[PDB]
Amino acid sequence: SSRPQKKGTAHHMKTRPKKTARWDIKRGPAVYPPLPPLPAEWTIVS
Amino acid sequence: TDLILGRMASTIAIHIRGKNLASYTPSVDMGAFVIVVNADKVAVSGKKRTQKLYRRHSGRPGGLKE
Amino acid sequence: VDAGIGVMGTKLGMMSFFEEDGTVVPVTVIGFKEGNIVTQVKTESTDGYNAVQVGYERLRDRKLTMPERGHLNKAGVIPMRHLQEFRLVSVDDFTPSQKLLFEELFKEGDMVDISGTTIGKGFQGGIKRHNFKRGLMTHGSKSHRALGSIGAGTTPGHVYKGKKMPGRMGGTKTKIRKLKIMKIDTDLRVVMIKGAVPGKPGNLLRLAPAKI
Amino acid sequence: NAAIRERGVYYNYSKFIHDLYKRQLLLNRKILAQIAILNPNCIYMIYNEIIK
RNA sequence: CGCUGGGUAGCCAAGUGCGGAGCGGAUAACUGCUGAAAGCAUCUAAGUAGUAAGCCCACCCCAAGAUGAGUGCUCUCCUA
RNA sequence: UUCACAUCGACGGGAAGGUUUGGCACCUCGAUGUCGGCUCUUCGCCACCUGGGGCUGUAGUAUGUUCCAAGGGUUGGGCUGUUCGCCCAUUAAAGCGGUACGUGAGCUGGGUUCAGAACGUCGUGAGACAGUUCGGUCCAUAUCCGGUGUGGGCGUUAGAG
RNA sequence: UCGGAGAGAGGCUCGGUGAAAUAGACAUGUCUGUGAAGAUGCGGACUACCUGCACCUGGACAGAAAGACCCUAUGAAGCU
RNA sequence: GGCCAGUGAGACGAUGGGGGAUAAGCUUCAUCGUCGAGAGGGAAACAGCCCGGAUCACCAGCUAAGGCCCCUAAAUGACCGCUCAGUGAUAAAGGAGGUAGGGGUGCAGAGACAGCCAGGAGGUUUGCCUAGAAGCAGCCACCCUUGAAAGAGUGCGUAAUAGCUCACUGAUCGAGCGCUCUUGCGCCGAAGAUGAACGGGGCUAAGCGGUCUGCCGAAGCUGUGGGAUGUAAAAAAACAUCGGUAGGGGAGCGUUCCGUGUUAGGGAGAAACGCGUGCGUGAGCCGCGUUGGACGAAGCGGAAGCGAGAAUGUCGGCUUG
RNA sequence: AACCCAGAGCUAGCUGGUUCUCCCCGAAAUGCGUUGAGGCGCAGCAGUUGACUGGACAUCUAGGGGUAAAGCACUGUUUCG
RNA sequence: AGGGUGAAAAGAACCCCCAUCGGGGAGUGAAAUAGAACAUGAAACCGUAAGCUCUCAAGCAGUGGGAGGGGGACCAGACC
């Protein structure tokens, strides 16, 4: 035989989810245009 | 008739839960009854018909049903 | 699915028929308390299968309840105790109105199968249910007649289902097969049949032709 | 998602957020999933103004 | 059972009967039939034939708590 | 006899398995009881036989080797505590292993060779030997799972046979 | 071989009397995988109505009892 | 420096090595990351692998790792190619007209490949051996001629011959045919003992490679509000911080007794025991009791036989079986 | 090498256990030495109180090397003419 | 190892059950639920009554959401 089985934390460096597609690493979050600031949350009315 | 099995099973599942209704709560039975006629003529793709096994087993060993 | 209608009769002891060639054969003697009247036929139209329903042991009306005797008087026949059907292929010509069928249909057919309640032996051990062996009777042994090992070691952690334990042995019906018929009696209402039927003299006994 | 998918034409939950942030609606906070069942004509007005 | 001699009914075998059937279905290895991708060929890529104590069914029994809780026949619900 | 590939295959190489002896010391020593036998399983195929086939330096019988196939079987004994093994009579064949000896909360002998004694050898001696021989207590009412039987309740949308 | 029958005392049922070892709480399945590398308790699947009685003991690394074997202690003791 | 602790059994992963058999979740070192002492998300489950550092609340939003058929949140999304083995979890040497390409080199409209048919002869049985060896048991070279081409022969066969047949050429139809390297994904090699056992169902895409847009996705970040620590030495306000084992420091609650105390209060119900739609960061306080019947608060202080879930603890009571 | 009492609450580098709350900080499993290896003393790394200090993190420059790579100029070793 | 009915035995006259033990009325007492096992009586433990709910169900028995139902209610939206 002479093939070692990959045990714990060697199983984790092999069988962890790795996204090995060079496209899907390039993705940043989407950017919307900036909006004007929202008004005050409330106002004193006397 | 001439519908493939697993995608039909998923689109029957998405109505059998109730995930096409806005009243979907996953703790109650908001689903819908479905009826599937012509189960004898369900299509499959590839080599499911001669290579996919619905094996079962009782508790005792040596009872795995081919 | 059976290959034809059968009858039912009671066991009345055993004896030996002397064949005129010189042989001595052990036969069981079958009596007939009452004729096996076809009570209810169930065809492919009004039922999912086809079977002919006969009965046996004409009795007193006090012995029989209202649904039983109402079912039997739906056919216009005598009130009788036992009641069994034979499933038969759809070529049948059987009226449920009092067909007192005579026992001539088995003599030329020199092969018959029989079913019956074997005699019960109660809660018996593994030494007679499943034909085990006993341990050493001597040499310092202690597991006389006991059940021995039950399972494997740690890796199952349980015992397999259907494992041969002691339990109630007899009481269920059995069918012994292809039993060759012998001298019927057209006046003694008695059929010789060479073999050994299940049970002591007195019990019900299915007597139906073979299924080979 | 189950409320938007009742249109029949292929409009997913992702496209409702496509044209929910492009048409500038700051942060309805998924309480349109509450008035999506308490006020289904009002969420039909929400979505039918997301289309235009 | 004082020790022996036999024995009916039970129980049992060493005794007595019976069973292991199927030109039934599909296959594994193999032999093929036409037969192309390379006008030759090849059991195969289309279709298809023989065939295993193996698989399933048939065989004997239990069996609708099979909560999917079946089907058929029949009886009974009255007085204020 | 010619002929690498009917059958063996030197010099070398590549694997699978975890059944031997090993390596590590990762669970267990406020206790995981080793070896053999009896009883009783069940499973694997790396096939001894049975069923089908290919090739044969297969004339036929019998083969040699190999493919599919684990349904079923795989004897009785003399020696030894024996596993293994030798031998006799055979048989279609008398397969190899896993399941913590598979199985000592089911059972008994050699042993982790316990306490007595003797022989050889070692030691000045007390004593000791992975040397030998005789004798040498082995517990247990099943709580739960698991199993084999056998009920009772309730359900099966009226209640039953 | 190769078991078989019968008689007692138990075992089973009823009436009386009535413990014990053990015990974190137990609403206490099987396979397979993972995990302190042998899981009813974690994961996936399958299977199981609830709850008794009588037997059997494969597991709960079952009960005992701070392993007699192995090693450590600048431990104890006997003996030479 | 002063006072004062633990720790000195480590583990895995990457790199650099030694021991081994470049075998071990093996052993010993050197730098680093995590666990130890680290919660959450992805990894089916699963200390050490990736993201990530948990003060607390919200029935808030945006994201990292990773995913978007169903179980289970988000795309049965779009456009190029590939795989037909359920490969998609797996291990090699080696084999292969598998399929999708790519680079070389050789033949063709003066007919290129595959099949049928025709020829394949003369010296010659080259010279040795053998009975024969005539190409076919073998040894040595292994010719030229007619020609369209023929090799002392490619194999079978025969006692040897004879003979069947091929490399090569001629002829009919006709337009692609070889033989090498090479990747991508595949096939076989590839077989275990209880039972699908590879998350499941399943899918020819829901698989594998290349891009494009969005969404889901943590206790991360942001937002809105509290608490505490450090600045800091009063308050307010500000900025930073606030996971934690062994351990260190600061601040507090409770208990019984004592000083005030022959305290206030109390047979118009004290302590106890039981109760809460109350308050605190919590240890706890306060309040209510058709129970009970005589003691005893708070505040400001002190002293402990001072706080219980563990010791095969121990003493009583009562279970299980 | 009896039992009881007493020294004796012998001794144990060993085992188990050591009880209320909140806040801040926060390791180590390394070296040396040891009749020592599962103990201990010191150093390393915590907590708190200070006294001197002006550094950390990025970038650049300068110094010694002899590792990786490489090479046969020394020491060996080796294939062929 | 085993203390504490009351302030005072004033310790239950008499009637019934009845062989006793004990129990219920009546009487003493401020209290008889202070009755001689007698003072406050907690937890484990054993029970009985009322409300909701479990017999296709896999679960360190919780927690977040909460179907259905029940109870008093007054900030009737709240609480259990």
Curated annotation (Swiss-Prot), chain A:
Q: Disulphide bridges in this chain?
A: none
Its subunit composition reads: Component of the chloroplast large ribosomal subunit (LSU). Mature 70S chloroplast ribosomes of higher plants consist of a small (30S) and a large (50S) subunit. The 30S small subunit contains 1 molecule of ribosomal RNA (16S rRNA) and 24 different proteins. The 50S large subunit contains 3 rRNA molecules (23S, 5S and 4.5S rRNA) and 33 different proteins.
Q: Where in the cell is it found?
A: Plastid, Chloroplast
Family, as annotated: Belongs to the chloroplast-specific ribosomal protein cL38 family.
Q: What does this protein do?
A: Component of the chloroplast ribosome (chloro-ribosome), a dedicated translation machinery responsible for the synthesis of chloroplast genome-encoded proteins, including proteins of the transcription and translation machinery and components of the photosynthetic apparatus.
> Protein name, please?
Large ribosomal subunit protein cL38
From Swiss-Prot, chain B:
**Quaternary context:** Component of the chloroplast large ribosomal subunit (LSU). Mature 70S chloroplast ribosomes of higher plants consist of a small (30S) and a large (50S) subunit. The 30S small subunit contains 1 molecule of ribosomal RNA (16S rRNA) and 24 different proteins. The 50S large subunit contains 3 rRNA molecules (23S, 5S and 4.5S rRNA) and 33 different proteins.
Protein name, entry field: Large ribosomal subunit protein uL13c
Instruction: Summarize which stretch of the complete protein this chain spans.
Output: 120 to 185 of 250
Membership in a protein family? Belongs to the universal ribosomal protein uL13 family.
Q: What does this protein do?
A: Component of the chloroplast ribosome (chloro-ribosome), a dedicated translation machinery responsible for the synthesis of chloroplast genome-encoded proteins, including proteins of the transcription and translation machinery and components of the photosynthetic apparatus.
Localization in the cell: Plastid, Chloroplast
Curated annotation (Swiss-Prot), chain C:
Q: Tell me if S-adenosyl-L-methionine is a UniProt keyword of this record.
A: no
GO CC aspect terms: chloroplast envelope; ribonucleoprotein complex; ribosome
One GO MF annotation is: rRNA binding
Q: Where in the cell is it found?
A: Plastid, Chloroplast
Q: Which domain of life is it from?
A: Eukaryota
Name one process (GO BP) from the record. translation
Q: What is its main location?
A: plastid
- Write out the entry's keywords from A to Z: Chloroplast, Plastid, Ribonucleoprotein, Ribosomal protein, RNA-binding, rRNA-binding, Transit peptide
Record region (Disordered): 143-171
Q: Does the keyword Ribosomal protein apply?
A: yes
**SUBUNIT field:** Component of the chloroplast large ribosomal subunit (LSU). Mature 70S chloroplast ribosomes of higher plants consist of a small (30S) and a large (50S) subunit. The 30S small subunit contains 1 molecule of ribosomal RNA (16S rRNA) and 24 different proteins. The 50S large subunit contains 3 rRNA molecules (23S, 5S and 4.5S rRNA) and 33 different proteins.
Q: Which family does it belong to?
A: Belongs to the universal ribosomal protein uL3 family.
User: What role does it play?
Assistant: Component of the chloroplast ribosome (chloro-ribosome), a dedicated translation machinery responsible for the synthesis of chloroplast genome-encoded proteins, including proteins of the transcription and translation machinery and components of the photosynthetic apparatus.
Name of the protein? Large ribosomal subunit protein uL3c
From the entire protein, which fragment is shown? 86 to 297 of 305
From Swiss-Prot, chain D:
Would you tell me the protein name for this molecule?
Large ribosomal subunit protein bL20c
Q: Which top-rank group of organisms is this from?
A: Eukaryota
Q: What family does the entry list?
A: Belongs to the bacterial ribosomal protein bL20 family.
Q: What does this protein do?
A: Component of the chloroplast ribosome (chloro-ribosome), a dedicated translation machinery responsible for the synthesis of chloroplast genome-encoded proteins, including proteins of the transcription and translation machinery and components of the photosynthetic apparatus.
Listed under subunit, the entry gives: Component of the chloroplast large ribosomal subunit (LSU). Mature 70S chloroplast ribosomes of higher plants consist of a small (30S) and a large (50S) subunit. The 30S small subunit contains 1 molecule of ribosomal RNA (16S rRNA) and 24 different proteins. The 50S large subunit contains 3 rRNA molecules (23S, 5S and 4.5S rRNA) and 33 different proteins.
Compartment annotation: Plastid, Chloroplast
Native source organism of the sequence: Spinacia oleracea (Spinach)
